[PDB]
Amino acid sequence: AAAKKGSEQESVKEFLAKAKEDFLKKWESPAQNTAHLDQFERIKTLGTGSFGRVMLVKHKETGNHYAMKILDKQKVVKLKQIEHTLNEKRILQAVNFPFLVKLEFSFKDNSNLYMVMEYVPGGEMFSHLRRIGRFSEPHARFYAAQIVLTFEYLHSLDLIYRDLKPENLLIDQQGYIQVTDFGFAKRVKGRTWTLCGTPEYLAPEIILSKGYNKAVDWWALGVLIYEMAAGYPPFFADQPIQIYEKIVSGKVRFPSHFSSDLKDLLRNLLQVDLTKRFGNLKNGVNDIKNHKWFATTDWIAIYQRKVEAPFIPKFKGPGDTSNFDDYEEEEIRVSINEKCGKEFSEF
Protein backbone atom coordinates (compact mmCIF):
# COMPACT_ATOMS: atom_id res chain seq x y z
CA ALA A 1 0.00 0.00 0.00
CA ALA A 2 2.84 2.37 0.93
CA ALA A 3 5.03 1.14 -1.92
CA LYS A 4 2.67 1.92 -4.83
CA LYS A 5 3.84 4.52 -7.35
CA GLY A 6 0.69 5.78 -9.06
CA SER A 7 -0.09 9.31 -10.22
CA GLU A 8 -0.52 10.64 -6.67
CA GLN A 9 3.19 10.19 -5.94
CA GLU A 10 4.19 12.08 -9.11
CA SER A 11 2.09 15.07 -8.02
CA VAL A 12 4.09 15.15 -4.74
CA LYS A 13 7.36 14.76 -6.69
CA GLU A 14 6.46 17.62 -9.02
CA PHE A 15 5.46 19.80 -6.07
CA LEU A 16 8.65 19.06 -4.18
CA ALA A 17 10.76 19.65 -7.30
CA LYS A 18 9.37 23.17 -7.73
CA ALA A 19 9.73 23.80 -3.98
CA LYS A 20 13.41 22.89 -4.14
CA GLU A 21 13.92 25.22 -7.08
CA ASP A 22 12.49 28.15 -5.09
CA PHE A 23 14.38 27.19 -1.96
CA LEU A 24 17.78 26.95 -3.66
CA LYS A 25 17.48 30.40 -5.18
CA LYS A 26 17.00 31.91 -1.71
CA TRP A 27 19.48 29.54 -0.08
CA GLU A 28 22.22 30.69 -2.47
CA SER A 29 21.43 34.42 -2.11
CA PRO A 30 19.92 35.06 1.34
CA ALA A 31 17.95 38.21 2.16
CA GLN A 32 19.97 40.42 4.50
CA ASN A 33 19.43 43.69 6.39
CA THR A 34 15.80 44.21 5.35
CA ALA A 35 14.69 46.41 8.24
CA HIS A 36 15.98 48.38 11.25
CA LEU A 37 15.13 48.24 14.98
CA ASP A 38 13.54 51.69 15.03
CA GLN A 39 10.89 50.58 12.53
CA PHE A 40 9.21 48.48 15.23
CA GLU A 41 7.42 49.31 18.43
CA ARG A 42 8.28 46.69 21.06
CA ILE A 43 5.26 45.59 23.07
CA LYS A 44 5.65 42.42 25.15
CA THR A 45 7.79 39.31 25.58
CA LEU A 46 6.24 36.14 24.10
CA GLY A 47 8.98 33.70 25.07
CA THR A 48 12.61 33.38 26.12
CA GLY A 49 15.72 31.36 25.34
CA SER A 50 19.30 30.96 26.59
CA PHE A 51 20.64 33.85 24.54
CA GLY A 52 17.59 35.94 23.66
CA ARG A 53 13.84 36.49 23.67
CA VAL A 54 10.90 36.83 21.30
CA MET A 55 8.78 39.97 21.60
CA LEU A 56 5.48 41.05 20.15
CA VAL A 57 6.20 44.17 18.06
CA LYS A 58 4.23 46.48 15.77
CA HIS A 59 5.69 47.53 12.43
CA LYS A 60 5.22 51.31 12.38
CA GLU A 61 4.82 51.83 8.64
CA THR A 62 2.17 49.13 8.20
CA GLY A 63 0.76 48.67 11.73
CA ASN A 64 1.24 44.92 11.32
CA HIS A 65 2.14 42.91 14.43
CA TYR A 66 5.10 40.53 14.32
CA ALA A 67 7.15 38.32 16.61
CA MET A 68 10.69 39.69 16.81
CA LYS A 69 13.42 37.37 18.07
CA ILE A 70 16.28 39.29 19.66
CA LEU A 71 19.57 37.44 20.13
CA ASP A 72 22.51 38.84 22.07
CA LYS A 73 25.59 38.22 19.88
CA GLN A 74 27.97 37.90 22.85
CA LYS A 75 25.74 35.28 24.46
CA VAL A 76 25.48 33.31 21.20
CA VAL A 77 29.26 33.26 20.98
CA LYS A 78 29.70 32.16 24.62
CA LEU A 79 27.30 29.24 24.06
CA LYS A 80 29.04 28.29 20.80
CA GLN A 81 25.85 28.71 18.76
CA ILE A 82 27.28 30.97 16.07
CA GLU A 83 27.01 28.50 13.19
CA HIS A 84 23.65 27.21 14.40
CA THR A 85 22.31 30.79 14.43
CA LEU A 86 23.65 31.35 10.91
CA ASN A 87 21.95 28.09 9.89
CA GLU A 88 18.67 29.23 11.41
CA LYS A 89 18.46 32.55 9.61
CA ARG A 90 19.75 31.24 6.25
CA ILE A 91 17.28 28.35 6.27
CA LEU A 92 14.29 30.25 7.62
CA GLN A 93 14.51 33.04 5.01
CA ALA A 94 14.64 30.37 2.28
CA VAL A 95 11.70 28.09 3.13
CA ASN A 96 7.97 28.37 2.32
CA PHE A 97 5.30 25.95 3.57
CA PRO A 98 1.79 26.43 4.97
CA PHE A 99 2.85 25.15 8.42
CA LEU A 100 6.14 27.05 8.69
CA VAL A 101 6.24 30.45 10.34
CA LYS A 102 7.57 33.06 7.88
CA LEU A 103 10.65 35.19 8.48
CA GLU A 104 9.55 38.66 7.29
CA PHE A 105 12.70 40.70 8.04
CA SER A 106 16.14 40.26 9.56
CA PHE A 107 18.88 42.69 10.56
CA LYS A 108 21.53 43.26 13.23
CA ASP A 109 23.06 46.13 15.19
CA ASN A 110 26.14 46.52 17.47
CA SER A 111 24.75 44.20 20.13
CA ASN A 112 22.03 41.96 18.74
CA LEU A 113 20.67 39.85 15.90
CA TYR A 114 17.03 40.32 14.93
CA MET A 115 14.59 37.94 13.23
CA VAL A 116 11.15 39.37 12.63
CA MET A 117 8.69 36.53 12.05
CA GLU A 118 4.91 36.24 11.72
CA TYR A 119 3.07 36.60 15.02
CA VAL A 120 0.94 33.53 15.79
CA PRO A 121 -1.62 34.69 18.34
CA GLY A 122 -2.99 31.28 19.40
CA GLY A 123 0.02 30.54 21.62
CA GLU A 124 2.11 27.38 22.00
CA MET A 125 0.64 23.88 21.61
CA PHE A 126 2.49 23.29 24.89
CA SER A 127 0.24 25.68 26.82
CA HIS A 128 -2.99 24.14 25.50
CA LEU A 129 -1.83 20.54 25.90
CA ARG A 130 -0.76 21.00 29.54
CA ARG A 131 -3.99 22.82 30.40
CA ILE A 132 -6.39 20.35 28.74
CA GLY A 133 -4.32 17.34 29.81
CA ARG A 134 -4.24 15.41 26.53
CA PHE A 135 -5.73 15.61 23.03
CA SER A 136 -8.14 13.05 21.57
CA GLU A 137 -6.60 10.85 18.87
CA PRO A 138 -8.48 12.70 16.10
CA HIS A 139 -7.22 16.00 17.54
CA ALA A 140 -3.64 14.67 17.76
CA ARG A 141 -3.87 13.14 14.27
CA PHE A 142 -4.84 16.53 12.84
CA TYR A 143 -1.68 18.21 14.24
CA ALA A 144 0.47 15.16 13.51
CA ALA A 145 -0.54 15.19 9.84
CA GLN A 146 0.76 18.76 9.52
CA ILE A 147 4.15 17.81 10.99
CA VAL A 148 4.36 14.82 8.64
CA LEU A 149 3.83 17.05 5.58
CA THR A 150 6.20 19.69 7.00
CA PHE A 151 9.01 17.15 7.55
CA GLU A 152 8.38 15.74 4.06
CA TYR A 153 8.91 19.26 2.73
CA LEU A 154 11.92 20.06 4.95
CA HIS A 155 13.64 16.72 4.39
CA SER A 156 13.32 16.98 0.58
CA LEU A 157 15.43 20.16 0.83
CA ASP A 158 18.10 18.20 2.76
CA LEU A 159 17.06 19.96 5.96
CA ILE A 160 16.88 18.38 9.41
CA TYR A 161 14.78 20.24 12.01
CA ARG A 162 16.07 18.66 15.25
CA ASP A 163 13.89 20.26 17.95
CA LEU A 164 10.29 19.04 17.58
CA LYS A 165 8.26 19.57 20.76
CA PRO A 166 4.98 21.20 21.82
CA GLU A 167 6.94 24.30 22.98
CA ASN A 168 7.96 24.92 19.35
CA LEU A 169 4.56 24.60 17.70
CA LEU A 170 2.19 27.56 17.58
CA ILE A 171 -1.56 27.51 16.86
CA ASP A 172 -2.75 30.11 14.36
CA GLN A 173 -6.16 31.77 14.11
CA GLN A 174 -7.55 28.95 11.98
CA GLY A 175 -6.39 26.36 14.52
CA TYR A 176 -3.58 25.10 12.30
CA ILE A 177 0.07 24.50 13.34
CA GLN A 178 2.92 26.92 12.71
CA VAL A 179 6.38 25.42 13.32
CA THR A 180 8.92 27.87 14.69
CA ASP A 181 12.32 27.75 16.44
CA PHE A 182 14.73 26.80 13.66
CA GLY A 183 17.71 27.20 15.98
CA PHE A 184 19.00 23.64 15.34
CA ALA A 185 17.83 23.25 11.74
CA LYS A 186 20.66 22.22 9.40
CA ARG A 187 21.18 21.57 5.70
CA VAL A 188 23.21 18.41 5.41
CA LYS A 189 23.55 15.55 2.95
CA GLY A 190 24.51 12.25 4.52
CA ARG A 191 25.20 12.45 8.25
CA THR A 192 25.86 14.82 11.15
CA TRP A 193 27.00 14.50 14.76
CA THR A 194 26.01 17.54 16.82
CA LEU A 195 24.59 16.72 20.22
CA CYS A 196 21.47 18.89 20.27
CA GLY A 197 17.73 18.75 20.86
CA THR A 198 15.57 18.39 23.98
CA PRO A 199 16.16 15.34 26.24
CA GLU A 200 12.60 13.87 26.07
CA TYR A 201 12.70 14.02 22.26
CA LEU A 202 16.25 12.79 21.48
CA ALA A 203 16.60 9.68 19.29
CA PRO A 204 18.86 6.91 20.74
CA GLU A 205 21.54 7.46 18.07
CA ILE A 206 21.93 11.07 19.21
CA ILE A 207 22.35 10.02 22.85
CA LEU A 208 24.87 7.34 21.89
CA SER A 209 26.89 9.80 19.77
CA LYS A 210 26.43 7.65 16.70
CA GLY A 211 26.16 10.10 13.84
CA TYR A 212 22.67 10.50 12.48
CA ASN A 213 20.34 11.94 9.84
CA LYS A 214 16.73 12.99 9.24
CA ALA A 215 15.50 9.79 10.90
CA VAL A 216 15.83 11.62 14.24
CA ASP A 217 12.97 13.95 13.23
CA TRP A 218 10.70 10.92 12.65
CA TRP A 219 11.63 9.52 16.07
CA ALA A 220 10.77 12.93 17.53
CA LEU A 221 7.41 12.78 15.73
CA GLY A 222 6.78 9.51 17.57
CA VAL A 223 7.48 11.26 20.88
CA LEU A 224 5.24 14.18 19.95
CA ILE A 225 2.26 12.06 18.97
CA TYR A 226 2.62 10.01 22.16
CA GLU A 227 2.74 13.12 24.34
CA MET A 228 -0.23 14.73 22.57
CA ALA A 229 -2.37 11.63 22.97
CA ALA A 230 -1.18 10.58 26.47
CA GLY A 231 -0.64 13.97 28.09
CA TYR A 232 2.91 12.97 29.09
CA PRO A 233 5.94 11.91 27.01
CA PRO A 234 6.90 8.23 26.51
CA PHE A 235 10.18 8.76 28.42
CA PHE A 236 10.20 11.08 31.42
CA ALA A 237 12.08 11.35 34.72
CA ASP A 238 13.37 14.07 37.03
CA GLN A 239 16.91 14.09 35.58
CA PRO A 240 17.95 13.93 31.90
CA ILE A 241 20.37 11.00 32.49
CA GLN A 242 17.45 8.81 33.57
CA ILE A 243 15.45 9.96 30.53
CA TYR A 244 18.36 8.85 28.28
CA GLU A 245 18.49 5.47 30.01
CA LYS A 246 14.81 4.89 29.24
CA ILE A 247 15.21 6.08 25.64
CA VAL A 248 18.05 3.70 24.73
CA SER A 249 16.54 0.77 26.68
CA GLY A 250 14.21 -0.24 23.85
CA LYS A 251 11.13 -0.26 26.10
CA VAL A 252 8.00 1.87 25.65
CA ARG A 253 4.64 1.54 27.45
CA PHE A 254 1.32 2.89 26.18
CA PRO A 255 -1.78 4.14 28.02
CA SER A 256 -4.62 1.59 27.87
CA HIS A 257 -6.79 4.13 26.03
CA PHE A 258 -4.37 4.20 23.06
CA SER A 259 -5.99 2.58 20.01
CA SER A 260 -4.21 -0.42 18.51
CA ASP A 261 -3.51 1.55 15.31
CA LEU A 262 -1.90 4.36 17.33
CA LYS A 263 0.28 1.94 19.32
CA ASP A 264 1.35 0.27 16.09
CA LEU A 265 2.36 3.55 14.45
CA LEU A 266 4.23 4.60 17.58
CA ARG A 267 6.16 1.31 17.82
CA ASN A 268 7.40 1.88 14.27
CA LEU A 269 8.37 5.51 14.93
CA LEU A 270 9.89 4.87 18.37
CA GLN A 271 12.05 2.24 16.73
CA VAL A 272 15.59 2.12 18.11
CA ASP A 273 16.66 0.12 15.01
CA LEU A 274 17.12 2.57 12.10
CA THR A 275 16.69 -0.23 9.55
CA LYS A 276 13.16 -0.56 10.91
CA ARG A 277 12.13 3.01 11.76
CA PHE A 278 9.22 4.44 9.79
CA GLY A 279 10.26 7.41 7.69
CA ASN A 280 13.67 5.79 7.26
CA LEU A 281 12.69 2.87 5.01
CA LYS A 282 12.58 2.42 1.22
CA ASN A 283 9.03 3.82 1.10
CA GLY A 284 10.15 6.97 2.94
CA VAL A 285 7.41 9.12 4.44
CA ASN A 286 4.79 6.99 2.67
CA ASP A 287 5.03 4.24 5.30
CA ILE A 288 3.73 6.93 7.65
CA LYS A 289 1.15 8.55 5.35
CA ASN A 290 -0.38 5.17 4.52
CA HIS A 291 -0.38 3.80 8.07
CA LYS A 292 -3.80 2.68 9.32
CA TRP A 293 -3.86 5.42 11.97
CA PHE A 294 -3.91 8.01 9.16
CA ALA A 295 -6.58 6.27 7.05
CA THR A 296 -9.06 9.12 7.61
CA THR A 297 -6.48 11.80 6.81
CA ASP A 298 -6.91 13.64 3.49
CA TRP A 299 -3.36 14.90 3.01
CA ILE A 300 -4.23 17.38 0.26
CA ALA A 301 -7.14 18.83 2.25
CA ILE A 302 -4.78 19.30 5.21
CA TYR A 303 -2.23 21.08 3.02
CA GLN A 304 -4.97 23.30 1.58
CA ARG A 305 -6.22 24.07 5.10
CA LYS A 306 -9.70 22.84 4.14
CA VAL A 307 -10.06 20.54 7.15
CA GLU A 308 -11.95 21.71 10.21
CA ALA A 309 -9.65 22.26 13.18
CA PRO A 310 -10.22 20.69 16.63
CA PHE A 311 -10.30 24.16 18.18
CA ILE A 312 -9.86 27.85 17.41
CA PRO A 313 -7.87 29.90 19.94
CA LYS A 314 -9.57 32.77 21.77
CA PHE A 315 -8.91 36.00 19.87
CA LYS A 316 -9.44 39.34 21.59
CA GLY A 317 -8.54 41.75 18.80
CA PRO A 318 -5.04 42.35 17.37
CA GLY A 319 -2.05 42.62 19.71
CA ASP A 320 -3.78 40.46 22.33
CA THR A 321 -1.30 38.07 24.03
CA SER A 322 -3.67 36.27 26.41
CA ASN A 323 -2.69 32.91 24.90
CA PHE A 324 0.92 33.45 26.00
CA ASP A 325 2.48 33.32 29.48
CA ASP A 326 3.92 36.49 31.01
CA TYR A 327 7.71 36.87 31.13
CA GLU A 328 9.98 39.33 32.91
CA GLU A 329 10.81 42.25 30.62
CA GLU A 330 14.25 43.75 30.07
CA GLU A 331 15.26 46.93 28.26
CA ILE A 332 17.04 46.41 24.94
CA ARG A 333 20.48 48.00 25.10
CA VAL A 334 22.57 48.62 22.00
CA SER A 335 26.27 49.10 22.68
CA ILE A 336 28.10 52.01 21.02
CA ASN A 337 30.67 49.43 19.89
CA GLU A 338 30.11 46.65 17.38
CA LYS A 339 30.24 43.23 19.05
CA CYS A 340 31.28 40.07 17.22
CA GLY A 341 31.18 41.65 13.77
CA LYS A 342 33.30 39.06 11.98
CA GLU A 343 31.44 36.08 13.48
CA PHE A 344 28.04 37.24 12.20
CA SER A 345 29.08 39.06 9.03
CA GLU A 346 26.85 36.97 6.75
CA PHE A 347 23.77 37.46 8.97
Binding site: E167, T194, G197, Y232
Partner: peptide, 20 residues
Protein backbone atom coordinates in the same frame (compact mmCIF):
# COMPACT_ATOMS: atom_id res chain seq x y z
CA UNK B 1 -0.93 6.53 37.87
CA UNK B 2 1.59 7.46 35.19
CA UNK B 3 -0.20 10.77 34.71
CA UNK B 4 0.04 11.57 38.44
CA UNK B 5 3.73 10.69 38.37
CA UNK B 6 4.24 13.03 35.45
CA UNK B 7 2.34 15.91 37.08
CA UNK B 8 4.33 15.57 40.32
CA UNK B 9 7.67 15.50 38.40
CA UNK B 10 10.00 18.45 37.81
CA UNK B 11 9.54 18.33 34.04
CA UNK B 12 6.00 19.48 33.26
CA UNK B 13 7.17 23.04 32.57
CA UNK B 14 8.88 24.22 29.37
CA UNK B 15 11.89 22.03 28.61
CA UNK B 16 15.25 23.58 27.75
CA UNK B 17 17.28 22.32 24.78
CA UNK B 18 20.66 20.72 25.38
CA UNK B 19 23.80 21.04 23.25
CA UNK B 20 27.02 20.16 25.07
Amino acid sequence: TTYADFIASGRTGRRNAIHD
